Design a protein around this ligand. Structure first.
Ligand SMILES: Nc1ncnc2c1ncn2[C@@H]1O[C@H](COP(=O)(O)OP(=O)(O)OP(=O)(O)O)[C@@H](O)[C@H]1O
Ligand SMILES: Nc1ncnc2c1ncn2[C@@H]1O[C@H](COP(=O)(O)OP(=O)(O)O)[C@@H](O)[C@H]1O
Ligand SMILES: Nc1ncnc2c1ncn2[C@@H]1O[C@H](COP(=O)(O)OP(=O)(O)O)[C@@H](O)[C@H]1O
Ligand SMILES: [Mg+2]
Lengths: 52, 509, 456, 177, 74, 50, 456, 74
């Protein structure tokens, strides 16, 4: 089972990078909700720029 | 094994977060020394309240002076510094309670240390309590069986009794208490084991022996090892006692071991001397009797009216109890020392373990001359109370005559036969570790000692005789042993069936 | 007027009052929210009093408002306290409703005067052989039962309650001071089952309580006994551990700002003992017979708390761990137990001569212990061998089976009169039973039961 | 002991005199001048000299302060110096100001923010705090680039955290656990 | 930086604000500051001797044993 | 053996979701895009909760 | 930011810092312009820390600038410490240049956790026959070592260093707590001449040093042993006296003004013992096993320093003068040495039966030696004479030649496995080798070497 | 052949505390130049008593038999 999760770990780690930029937006819209209309442009660039 | 959608839990946590501002009462650390922190401010703090520091470190407020608050750190103090923030929590010192702690190893604040995930307890309760009063108690009469022949025959423990285990180092105090815990796995009594001041490898060996004998799922383990803070070593018996009092207050039955109350008194001595409190005998504080007596009073049996008052009518017609087995270490047999005499003045009897009987191979090592139970045969079952009347007197006749076996061929008949019966009863009470006996097997061994079926059997073949007799009754008279193991009944039918089976064993085997 | 809490250190609370409204010493105070009772000990100056709480202090904060009651802690007295269990503040704790009293008394008062003292030496027979022999009691007298942990103190008191209840027809007050809550429940259900509960008033402040309750509960039980004494009656007062009053005065002593005395005790030790013990006496109005259990720390009789307790008593019964380790109960050391009634103008010449001869034989047996341990009995002289034989028969005949110890053994209890005790110990000292074996003298009532046990 | 424990009866005696004789602002200016004079390094070197008596130290402090002290304030300086309590003179003044804030029903509130707040924003926070605390409040605004938004209100031991740094720490504690 | 002495109480200090002179109270009179455990600490009594009797209200008498710089223990 | 399989697997899921939650908080740079027009809104809700 | 010295009382130095830059508890500080290091003990408030100097304070003044390092005392760790002598700060005190380390570690860390314990009761093979038969060692265990001087303690330590280095691929760390300078130079030259210097890292905290050096020197040696354990190895850690560690804690606690506990000791006695002893364990990466020599004060085993030390020990090895006067080396008493691993659940039934049979035969020979001394050899029976012959064969087979003692014995050394020890002592106990003379059993390895010795 | 160093009973405790160190410095003169010396300290017990007097009068915290914590270091 340790050998099996070693194979599964890379594919789930590649699946997690498509959801973390949505996770920061979901937290940031709760903490400050007054900039939810601007953020739909902002997330098309800086989802790369804060991940790297 | 790991799909990606099951890690969407984070989104749900964001949907249950309260980001509204809440008002706190805050202060600032002025001085840190030896686990004691002085704090300016905190003008709404209560006595006994948890105080939040950065890094997840908590403290407890002890000294509410007019211009400062003294607090004792409930953990490592060495990351705390002058200028850091302190917060009130609104909470007098609590632990989580519930059936979700069964099977788990925790620290003194209830956080898990076994690596098996978070504990999903639905309730907390206070660590410091006053025990329920005079009118809410009920007298003890139900049995707790340890599985040892000498303990269940001579010094019987009941539900709600406090029974001390006292003696020198390395002569089997943890062994008797852990085997009393393992014998509760099919009896309905839940278990708490509190280790104070022990080594971590000793604690991990104890929990591995609990899992190997099938009793870990019935037992909460609370651990405060020898390199923790003295505050956690002082506070861990009250936290485990609150964990047993959850089952006491709802009409169920629990059993707790404090495997060193002597190390808890050393840790409380350390805390009191660092507060510059003036000491007395053996440099202990003046309230050291109060340190043990606030704890052990909580072990009690409570009436049906208390249980009906606590659950607001939900549990009706049931008593609850909490049995305690505290453990005290002595120095070279000194039982008249200050802490051992303080705990004897609190419990309902004690079991003395003697070092010389341990070193001669009498391995359960119970000194029958000075061990006593204050409840006695009110707690015992009927067959065990009937068959153990002659054990203590046979061990009593052996005490002085055990040194006479080097010249016993030139003695009269009554002295020789009393000494022969004394050697047979002494060889019967030897027993191995991790081998519990039921009601029927100890009744078979006690009937074989009491009714004179050991008389033509030599000493080196007593206990092997006992094992063979138990095996014969397991393959020929199993319905008789299942009749005895119901509630320990005794009558003439059981008497006649046991004596016919023992005579057929002595004639044909 | 109202004050404010300025300091909370454990059981000890400092309250600041306005300067024209500072409350007196021993005045009760009430916290406005939680209804915690405080009792004032000291006036520190600056409006601030230092007090001790009668309860738990967890949950209390600085800044809480505190009212003063204008008087001391007052408990109900009279006929309505009988049959009832109360705590230190006089509140009922038996779930049986309110106490219907007609008056309340404060728990602090002075001792009665020298002109009000009453003398008397009328003998009180206890039915126990060693107590009637070597330290006899008097009606209206004071009894201490000294002893270490687990040597018997409570078993002896329960036997003394049971045998002193035979020829007494008045009331009784029982005060539990710092002992086991289970012992209080057993004694209450025993008196309720045998219908003697309506003569006895019960006060309890046990080992589970904060130390203000343990510090002040014996004053409440003594106030109820003082009301029964000042109505002109003959009353019994039983106190299980008076040592536990003293130890409660240890626990608050450094928090009250005091420098420690020897072995960490409070410096006011003898005065707190004297202010409590001088109210227990019989007066010319009525009489109090008192039995008190007295704890000895670490089996050391030269510890200052029993050593101050010794001169407040008429009769002193010292128990021993060595005598109980020999199997002898009620475990009384006969060379350490004295009483002022052992005097030839009180008990007569015959009883006094028997007691002095028993103490002479046991003292000369105590002086031969090391030479008997090293060389044996065989190298003594012949009169020494005869005295060791009579001394072991005296030591075995001082034991007795008890009615309250019937659960421990199954042997029935015995009541022995004083005449049979004097005649039996005189017959052992004269040589009338030199042919009997010594184990026939063990755990019997009379000397005639030793005669029947010798033929077995 | 602490400095506030020692400085409490001097400030209480000065506050009870100044409330009994209607001289609150006179003693507040006098204790402010006395605290600031006693914290200057030359006066602090003079007040620690071993050959000077306490009367000469009080006379030097009275001659330095001059017209800012009336005669009962000079009597207070001689009573402080005779009991060897001159180093308490800042703490005494601070405790006096706390007593005067309880008498005029006012509270001194420090507000820290991520960007500058206008008078409309300060009047709005002051009215909300005056409704909560039942006192006239006095705000003291300050800046901090550590906050990304919001304000932090500090009134004595009361802390109200409305900044998004605290909400970020709450979200970090909620997702870490 | 020692602890508070028994004459450091704010009626006494406010007294010294109102008049600095020691003759505000007579040399044979004083006032009770503190009562604890049979010990009475008194501000004043500037002409007392060691072992001298002190008259209290209610007929109570005392004796001075400590004659400190600021206070009298009786 | 099957209990230790599930406990090992749960320690891996808890470690992965702990580092992903520690990465999502560190991406607070969206909150760094704020101006005074949202600060006036934040001071309004700090008025509303007193 | 740096601070200034405000107070020098002895070795206790107070340093004032700015209020936003107060250094942590146990942080190392450096005095500017001087070779003096300080370790922070307490934070007193107002920026002032109270610290202990790790050297002489003669010539220091108030006003000196003090720099903070940002961390605890950091020592060199790794392979470069082997063969080198170091002090408590990790500086070299041999004149052999700098230590060429790649890593430095701080000396304060927690114990390994509950989930990091290795489990089981795995034995550490030493290769010595009397140790692996009578008092077996555990991996992660602790060994008390008793005896005086001149009976072979140092030779046993060098043989344990050589055996753990060559046969198990591990390392050793010596920490001399209260090291005498003459004996440390002697021990260094004895380890050069026995070719075992490059297998052990030496840390000395000498007797003429102030007691914080003698308090922290075992933590320094334990930190180097932890790095050796974290490379996947089995490490030995030798502590020269644990009582001098306890006494250095007493002296440091007396210098800070703490209120002392019973019999003069520090109130943190059990905690300071537990911080050192709980780091010596078996973990999932490797193990550290410790050999610690114990002094007993006033020959009192119930003194608090040996009573705190014996709660952590897993085995005792007792060295005897009477075994060394017979020529038997190593001089381990087989009757006085104990072990918690000598238990049939731990080591199995076979090893336990062989060891208890050897101990019964030596105990019966010990009492029969007094019988032969009182009345002569003609008093004994044929079975008693047979047991005397087997017991002398057992007593000579306990001796063993050592690789570090080849100058002394004039023989090659031997390493004996545990299987050969149990098989050889079982072969003597079953009477399989009664035809051999006893002098063939002296100073050999296995039982087969005694068989080939009895042909010559 | 002998240097005699004396710090008698009526002299100051500082001189009795310093005398063994002064005599040790005089003996070390011969050790550092390849010669051999022998020193007798006729009472080190009285040197510990004088250092205990110095440490208690300087209000340093006491320990067992009221000796300070650095008497082993002495
Ligand atoms: N009934 C028994 N039969 C045989 N051996 C036993 C028995 N009970 C205990 N032992 C052994 O006795 C030894 C000491 O027991 P144990 O560790 O319980 O003692 P202790 O007094 O609790 O010690 P500690 O000081 O560690 O608390 C153990 O090695 C154990 O295996
Ligand atoms: N008269 C007696 N007969 C038999 N056993 C007794 C007797 N008195 C005391 N014991 C034994 O000693 C124990 C302790 O007695 P107890 O009165 O509770 O002691 P103490 O009050 O001194 O603590 C009893 O529970 C019992 O086992
Ligand atoms: N294994 C051994 N074989 C032979 N002789 C030994 C052995 N071990 C010790 N000895 C003898 O005992 C003496 C003392 O040994 P040593 O370890 O130096 O004790 P210490 O270090 O206490 O002085 C040595 O000089 C040596 O002659
Ligand atoms: Mg009792």
């Amino acid at each position: 089972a340790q050998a099996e999760i070693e194979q599964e770990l890379n594919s789930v780690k590649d699946a997690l990078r498509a959801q973390v930029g949505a996770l920061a937006v979901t937290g940031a819209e709760k903490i400050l909700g007054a900039s939810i209309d601007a953020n739909a442009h902002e997330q098309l660039v800086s989802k790369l720029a804060a991940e790297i | 094994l790991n799909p990606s959608e099951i890690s969407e839990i984070i989104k749900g946590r964001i949907e249950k977060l309260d980001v509204a501002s809440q008002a706190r009462n805050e202060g600032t650390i002025v001085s840190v020394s030896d686990g004691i922190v002085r704090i300016y401010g905190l003008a709404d703090v209560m006595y006994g309240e948890m105080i939040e520091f950065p890094g997840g470190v908590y403290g407890m407020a002890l000294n509410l002076e007019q211009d400062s608050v003294g607090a004792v750190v409930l953990g490592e103090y060495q990351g705390l510094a002058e200028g850091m923030n302190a917060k009130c929590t609104g909470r007098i010192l609590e632990v989580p309670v519930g059936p979700e702690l069964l099977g788990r190893v925790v620290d003194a604040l209830g956080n898990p240390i076994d690596g098996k995930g978070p504990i999903d307890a639905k309730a907390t309760d206070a660590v410091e309590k006053v025990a329920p009063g005079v009118i809410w108690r009920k007298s003890v009469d139900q049995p707790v069986q340890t599985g040892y022949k000498s303990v269940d025959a001579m010094i019987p423990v009941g539900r709600g009794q406090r029974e001390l285990i006292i003696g020198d180092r390395q002569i089997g105090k943890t062994a008797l208490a852990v085997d009393a815990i393992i014998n509760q796995k099919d009896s309905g009594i839940k278990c708490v084991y509190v280790a104070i001041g022990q080594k971590q490898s000793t604690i991990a060996n104890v929990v591995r022996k609990l899992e190997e004998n099938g009793a870990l799922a019935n037992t909460i383990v609370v651990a405060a090892s020898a390199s923790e803070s003295a505050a956690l070593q002082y506070l861990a018996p009250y936290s485990g006692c609150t964990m047993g009092e959850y089952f006491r207050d709802r009409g169920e039955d629990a059993l707790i071991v404090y495997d060193d109350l002597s190390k808890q008194a050393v840790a409380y001595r350390q805390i009191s001397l660092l507060l510059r409190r003036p000491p007395g005998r053996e440099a202990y504080p003046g309230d050291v009797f109060y340190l043990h007596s606030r704890l052990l009073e909580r072990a009690s049996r409570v009436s049906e009216e208390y249980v009906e008052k606590f659950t607001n009518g939900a549990v009706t017609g049931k008593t609850g109890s909490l049995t305690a087995l505290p453990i005290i270490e002595t120095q070279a047999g000194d039982v008249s020392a200050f802490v051992p005499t303080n705990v004897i003045s609190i419990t309902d009897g004690q079991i003395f373990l003697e070092s010389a009987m341990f070193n001669s191979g009498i391995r359960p090592a119970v000194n029958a001359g000075i061990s006593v139970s204050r409840v006695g045969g009110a707690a015992q079952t009927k067959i065990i109370k009937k068959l153990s009347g002659g054990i203590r007197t046979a061990l009593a006749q052996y005490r002085e005559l055990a040194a006479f076996a080097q010249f016993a061929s030139d003695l009269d008949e009554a002295t020789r036969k009393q000494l022969e019966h004394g050697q047979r009863v002494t060889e019967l009470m030897k027993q191995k570790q991790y081998a519990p006996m039921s009601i029927a097997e100890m009744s078979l061994s006690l009937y074989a000692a009491e009714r004179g079926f050991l008389q033509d059997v030599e000493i080196a073949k007593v206990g092997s005789f006992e094992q063979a007799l138990i095996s014969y009754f397991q393959r020929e008279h199993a319905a008789l042993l299942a009749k005895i193991n119901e509630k320990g009944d005794f009558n003439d039918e059981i008497d006649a069936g046991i004596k016919a089976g023992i005579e057929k064993f002595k004639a044909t085997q | 007027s109202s004050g404010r809490i300025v300091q909370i250190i454990g059981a000890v609370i400092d309250v600041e009052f306005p300067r024209d409204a500072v409350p007196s010493i021993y005045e009760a105070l009430k916290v406005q929210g939680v209804e915690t009772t405080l009792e004032v000990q000291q006036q520190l100056g600056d409006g601030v009093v230092r007090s001790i709480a009668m309860g738990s202090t967890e949950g209390l904060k600085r800044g809480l408002n505190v009212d003063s009651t204008g008087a001391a802690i007052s408990v109900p007295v009279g006929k309505a306290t009988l049959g009832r269990i109360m705590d230190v503040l006089g509140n009922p704790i038996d779930e049986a409703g309110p106490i219907g009293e007609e008056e309340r008394w404060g728990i602090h008062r002075e001792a009665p005067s020298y002109a009000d003292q009453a003398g008397g030496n009328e003998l009180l027979e206890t039915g126990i052989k060693v107590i009637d022999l070597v330290c006899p009691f008097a009606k209206g007298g004071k009894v201490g039962l000294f002893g270490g942990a687990g040597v018997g103190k409570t078993v002896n008191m329960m036997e003394l309650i049971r045998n002193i209840a035979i020829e007494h027809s008045g009331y009784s007050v029982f005060a539990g001071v710092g002992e086991r809550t289970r012992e209080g429940n057993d004694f209450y259900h025993e008196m309720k089952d045998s219908n003697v509960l309506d003569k006895v008033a019960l006060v309890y402040g046990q080992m589970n309580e904060p130390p203000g309750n343990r510090l002040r509960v014996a004053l409440t039980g003594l106030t109820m006994a003082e009301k029964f004494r000042d109505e002109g009656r003959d009353v019994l007062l039983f106190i299980d551990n008076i040592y536990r009053y003293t130890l409660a005065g240890t626990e608050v002593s450094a928090l009250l700002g005091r420098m420690p005395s020897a072995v960490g005790y409070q410096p006011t030790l003898a005065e707190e003992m004297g202010v409590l013990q001088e109210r227990i006496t019989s007066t010319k109005k009525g009489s109090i017979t008192s039995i008190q259990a007295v704890y000895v720390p670490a089996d050391d009789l030269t510890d200052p708390s029993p050593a101050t307790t010794f001169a407040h008593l008429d009769a002193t019964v010292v128990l021993s761990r060595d005598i109980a380790s020999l199997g002898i109960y009620p475990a009384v050391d006969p060379l350490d137990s004295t009483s002022r009634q052992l005097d030839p103008l009180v008990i007569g010449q015959d009883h006094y001569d028997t007691a002095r001869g028993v103490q002479y034989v046991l003292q000369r047996y105590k002086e031969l212990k090391d030479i008997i341990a090293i060389l044996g009995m065989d190298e003594l002289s012949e009169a020494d061998k005869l005295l060791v034989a009579r001394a072991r028969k005296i030591q075995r005949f001082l034991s007795q089976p008890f009615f309250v110890a019937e659960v421990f053994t199954g042997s029935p209890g015995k009541y022995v009169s004083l005449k049979d005790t004097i005649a039996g110990f005189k017959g052992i000292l004269n040589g009338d039973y030199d042919h009997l074996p010594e184990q026939a003298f063990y755990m019997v009532g009379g000397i005639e039961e030793a005669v029947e046990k010798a033929k077995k | 002991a602490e400095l506030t424990t020692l400085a409490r009866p001097y400030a209480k005696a000065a506050f009870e005199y100044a409330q009994a004789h209607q001289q609150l602002a006179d003693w507040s200016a006098a204790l402010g001048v006395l605290a600031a004079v006693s914290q200057d390094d030359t006066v602090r070197q003079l007040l620690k000299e071993p050959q000077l008596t306490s009367s000469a130290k009080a006379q030097s402090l009275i001659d330095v302060c001059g017209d800012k002290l009336n005669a009962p304030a000079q009597n207070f300086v001689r009573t402080v110096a005779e009991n060897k309590r001159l180093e308490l003179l800042p703490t005494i003044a601070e405790m006096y100001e706390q007593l005067k804030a309880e008498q005029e029903k006012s509270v001194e509130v420090e507000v820290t923010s991520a960007f500058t707040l206008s008078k409309e924003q300060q009047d709005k926070l002051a009215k909300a705090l005056s409704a909560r605390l039942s006192r006239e409040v006095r705000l003291h605004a300050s800046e901090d680039a550590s906050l990304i938004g919001g304000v932090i209100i500090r009134a004595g031991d009361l802390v109200i955290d409305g900044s998004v740094r605290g909400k970020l720490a709450k979200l970090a504690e909620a997702l870490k656990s | 930086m020692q602890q508070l002495n028994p004459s450091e109480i704010s009626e006494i200090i406010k007294g010294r604000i109102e008049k600095l002179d020691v003759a505000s109270q007579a040399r044979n009179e004083g006032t009770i500051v503190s009562v604890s455990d049979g010990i009475v600490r008194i501000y004043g009594l500037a002409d007392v001797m060691y072992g001298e009797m002190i008259e209290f209200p209610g007929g109570v008498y005392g004796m001075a044993l400590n004659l400190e710089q600021d206070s009298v223990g009786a």
